[model samples]
Target: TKQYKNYVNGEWKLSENEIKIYEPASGAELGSVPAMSTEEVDYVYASAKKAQPAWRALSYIERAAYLHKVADILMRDKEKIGAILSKEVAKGYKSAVSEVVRTAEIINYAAEEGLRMEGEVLEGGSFEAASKKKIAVVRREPVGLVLAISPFNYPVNLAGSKIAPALIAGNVIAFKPPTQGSISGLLLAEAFAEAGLPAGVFNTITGRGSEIGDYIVEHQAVNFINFTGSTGIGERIGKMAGMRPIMLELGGKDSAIVLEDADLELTAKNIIAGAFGYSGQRCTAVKRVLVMESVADELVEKIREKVLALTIGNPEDDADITPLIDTKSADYVEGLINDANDKGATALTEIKREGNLICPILFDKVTTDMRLAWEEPFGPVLPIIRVTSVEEAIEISNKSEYGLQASIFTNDFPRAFGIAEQLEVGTVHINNKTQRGTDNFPFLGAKKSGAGIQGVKYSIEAMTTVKSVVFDIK
Candidate 1:
């Protein structure tokens, strides 16, 4: 019911062509945005470049003040923005709204954290080489122009996460929300505009990855790139970016390693919730479980009924499992399920899909050769990989190319830490599910999982680099 316009250079823009935005749940038309060409991308790049110096010229407190106001502006309009997200991505209305609300809090925290960022003055007199008194002032300075590309799963929060820190760090931004989430993204951009953010300081550039992906990142003005998406796309962008400091949060096959000593009942609840929450679209979602064979049956028994009994219906109706972002996603997940079934994985529950609405599928007897054990379905499907020993469980968990996050379920704390330390991952949750939490806590990935770090504080760090001033103070 809405017609959205792209934000460019402090103005709403219409391009030579437009892409119709549709709601995934009902397939209803939500709105549209210009399918802008590289020319427009060039213009946006220039605009942001021109705006950067002035924006950075503002004191750190001044920049933080703008973000604080922007956060308030977003919170005040959370409901409307949440509803737009609900319609666009078929997310539950309450949860969608919460994303906005949570985002507002993240914005505030970014502003708060940004203010606390201070440089240190070094004294050379303490070192043996410093007979002559010397002083060095090292301060963080913004990376001139930032390109923020966010995925569809967490459009509002993820986009806000990147934008708030980048802005608070005194950098101009050109944000590109995923194609499906553009309308909702534009609405957020509208907030920055309404909050009276200086023109060209923040802009939304809309186009498909193929349409403007190359142009936007390759644009000479782009100094830093923050992206969240699939590994393939992230890889492509990384290759294309060519040495621009890029923060890329890629895909994950996050695993749950259940030791024989783990509480089956509690572990079951966490895995099901972690695996099926939001239909398992989260990058941190538990894609597979590596459980000790001695306790595997009990663990599977505890989760079997829950996975089969999961509610599936419309998100608007508050169903536990809603439609996916697109039919292609559903098809791909279903294909993986089929491939696994064909390759000896047992489907513990019935696999079904009505359009984009897919029932949660739990698989057992999944082997390494089976695609389910390794590939990230990004759907409401999970696999159980039983291992003979605790060492084996750790091996399988580490085998994943994604080292984003891993969960270990056990009553033994020392043992959990021992295993956690050995696992090649950015984060490990003990007696918990594999999921992303905490804004100020450092969140990163190892291997092909991600590059750079993201947290309120870390994000600000990534957006800015240290500028050093050294002088003889004798």
Candidate 2:
């Protein structure tokens, strides 16, 4: 219905080509955005390179103010932007609004981190010639032109997570949004411009990643790359990036361990929220559930009941379960369910798919060797595996190649505390779901889940380089 363009040099310019976007739930045509050419990508990189010096010359406090203004502008347009997100990405209305709010919070956190950026003084050893005259101070400076690539899910928040911190650390950015969610980038560009972000400081390029992604990634000018996506792609980028500083937040097969003494009702509710929310598109979604055999049967029944009762429809209609991003995604999830059933796993809930919408499916009595057990199913499919003991659960969880976040549901503090230490994950949640985090917490992924740390302060630290300043005092 509407046409969108790429934002370069602080202006929205039409391109020679365009790509059509669709409403996932209704299969309706939402709009089209320009597919940037290689030349445009080069232009965007050049502009960002041109603008970085002046932007970096400003005090961190002044740069922080710009992020704050952008946050405020986002808050003003949350409702409108949230709706657009829901339509563009098939996100539930409530979840979409939460994403917007989280984006603003990310910016605010980055804004505050500017004040916390401090230098440390290293004194010359007291025993070194008994002279205390030499002192070295270490400070952080921006890494310069950052290339940020964000996934479709939580587009606004993830984009903010990278852009806000990079800017707060005094770095300019060239952002590339997923092809499925380019509109979110356009909206973000508008907010940045309205907040007085200087031209060529923050640029957005829209198109098929295959066309322009390599161009941006392999460009000699890009100083750093902050990417959130699948592990395979992240690995490829990691190889291509060579020695450049790159942060990869990739795939996860996050597991939830329920001990025999755990609260069944609370565990069921939280696991359901984690597994089905956003249709399990989240990387932190509970892909595997390891339940003690003593209570596995009852817990699976409870989960099955909830899954069956869930409403599946358009995201805007307040449906409990919405459509996946596209039919291919739906098919892949559906195939996983079918494969699990064919491999002797029991399917407790009816499996159905209509266009992009898929009913949540529960697979019981799954073994660790099954494809569903090890593969990262980015869909509303829950594979419940029964474990003989807490030790087995921890062992099976750590055996997986992907380690992002894991949860343990048990009232036994001593036991839970012990298991948390052994879990090979970036984050461990005790008596809570695995998908839990705040904007200020250090959200990282262990193993293939992520590279480098991401939180307001930590990300700011990651995007900047440490420099030591020393003066010879006679």
Candidate 3:
């Protein structure tokens, strides 16, 4: 088996302990990555702390240039990187390729945003009249060392979402990639290193989260935390990072509200893609479908047909439905489906699992009280609830503890916007899936789904601090 080492202090560093990685689809060994120790983690922090000042001193344009180079390198290595994601994370060929492409797109966006990073001059309104001689200038500065933690699903894109913006904003980062996706993470680091990033500016530490997660969170030198994972871990990071700013993108049980006026064919197509793409591993994946009772039956029939059409197999085969992250995850998803059936819910699709591949499941007559309706399965399980009206849809959508992203499918333009305004989610889509978002738009989650907003520019803003400067005219 091939072996990989941690990328630290501008070079690859070996470790005494190594963790083996597996292909989730077949449970075959893919590779192994060094399991770093506390001493190695401390060394990484010191190097970054020492080199951050010079990196910050570089012109913003210079920083943008490096990111541009990274994006270029990403494209040159797209095929290889895409395969790594498929083998390491069990992401299908299509989705894995898209994630790789998005990584480049996000980096490009961050590069542009870095070039546009500027402080605003306070305009003199009432206070300007008295301060004609005094001008106040605001400047945004890097927030020093950043600790970025990313989950396994969408490993490259999600980690790059934090890393690109943090580096662009002149912050040094120590990345903690999920243990399951360490190989993919190291490959990402290679692009940056190849693009001529300074040694201490970016670092990756690969190890089990159970061993190193809290240590990084509570590190005194870490100025900020950009994390994407489960809510339970995020809450612990928040408490441990005491008084430090954190950008958390946590769990979600996103919903799609279908109105009677919704086009059944289009709605079913979108829901199928949103609920089953990547085996429904996305944080914004549609976990619940709230359809108006008037059109519920038709939508259900259409969605069942779509689900039945999907192929389930190994990700390398470009299958529509791949395996869960591991056998334990498969067990968890299976348990949820069993519970739903026992609780009077009707299964519209076959519930089957061979190895780690879980066949997509569609359940009807699911009420808000059902665990399947509210709990995030993070798998290819979708629960449908028939609601009486748009009001009922919104009510039930907001009932979940997560307010990540929500969508409304309707032909009524005004009503869509009206409902969008009141939904508790951070992002609301009109006539689209909850997973809809552009690279530059603010991607965030309300309530427990996320903390600070994150996009190219938004993440840059979060990784920086603002200071006011005044010029005294004599």
Candidate 4:
């Protein structure tokens, strides 16, 4: 077991109070982190605000150089950091290492994208009375300080996603990582420190969300906020954020809509991959399957077969199904499964539980009134709802409070477009699973799902503001 310190003002600072972090796979101590207080929040923001001018003064390419250094450091220590992540969150070690590598790529890509970010020069319009010689130069400026808060699921990858863009955009960052995964996040911050990043340019604060979460968000010195977590917390932050700019990536109940003409072989494989890959913990993971009744029977059998065939074990072995983040999460998943089973749904797989590892469960005949039909389990429990018409599928899918994402599995292009347009979600996948692609596609969420778009370029733009310099001809 190790004790960790908060990264503040380019130095590791020990704390008087701390909390223990346990590996979810087993009740073993992994590490402990500081419980920073409101006084610490004030000083941290002050340091970030102080560091902004110098960081913002650096050219885009120069800032990108710093990010490249951090990315290189990440690549250098991927295995060590990946191993910690695997134990801390109960994610398969293989997937854990992959997450770190992907994070480096995201940083490298963000740096390259930052170099390409350009402002436009505009001339006086002909319609206007002003002469053509008059010019307006528009350029983006850092939005001062950004307060980034990340969740436990993708602590390294998602935190890097926010930090990379915020840094390349020339903004100082104050990151608050989740409690369970704070060590991984601090290690990432250490990479920045090792890369010789300027003092106060990048910092990490350790503390419980219930203790100091809102205080930091509501802090006046903070210029912008970017958060990824549950919708309830996101909503509360929105209430307290007042007039500050915020980008929230909240909860989702994404569905896989399988049409009559869709390929059952491919659809079944994707649903299992999407829903149970990380034990269905992703916001973009398929929570339910809305299939055309003509092929629902076949799809159900295929899905059940795949779910039953999955391997379950500790994350250290890189099992297909592993223990969840904690017992609380497992309990919540079990509750959802039991509720639906009690209501009327038939369980195609045995509802087995050993510690936190839940056997991937498949349920059919799930109705609208049941909690499982619409609630987000964020676990390996997936529900299948049969529908006679496409209209019914669309209606049931759209009725949920969340509209983050939905998938349309079909062979018809024209119909794919029609259904894609009608469905009120952020991104609709055609003949594919609802997922966050490795590419640079815009990740948008509709309704209560989220408040803004997040991607490499989009994130850079969100953390910056435009400034125009108007010149008059002599």
Task: Give each model a TM-score.
Answer: 0.97, 0.97, 0.97, 0.98
Where does candidate 3 have its weakest 10-residue lDDT segment?
122-131
Off by over 4 Å in 3: 123-125, 128-132
Best by lDDT: 4
Give the clashing residue pairs of candidate 4, or none. Answer: none
Model 1 CA lDDT for position 313: 89
What would the per-residue lDDT of candidate 2 be over residues 1-474, giving only the tens digit for each residue? 599977789788999889999888887888999988898889999999999999988887788888899989999998989898889998888878889888898889888876678989877765585547888889989998999998999778889999998988888899888888889878878889888888999999888777987888999989999999989999989999999999989999989999999999999988998898888898988889999999998898889888888788888886778888887888788778878898999988887887777888889989866789998878889999998988889889999989889999998999888898999999998878876477788888888887998878888889999999877568
The worst-scoring run of ten residues by lDDT in candidate 4 lies at 125-134
Off by over 4 Å in 1: none
lDDT, candidate 1, at 173: 91
The true-versus-predicted C-alpha distance at residue 282 of model 4, in Å, is 1.0
Model 2 quality (TM-score): 0.97
- Tens-digit lDDT string for candidate 4 (59-92): 8888889899989999999999999999988899
Candidate 1 — which pairs collide?
A: none
Q: Give the TM-score of candidate 4.
A: 0.98
Instruction: Report, for every candidate in turn, its global Cα lDDT versus the true structure.
Output: 0.88, 0.87, 0.87, 0.89
Q: Which stretches of candidate 2 lie over 4 Å from their true place?
A: none
- CA deviation > 4 Å runs, candidate 4: 130-133
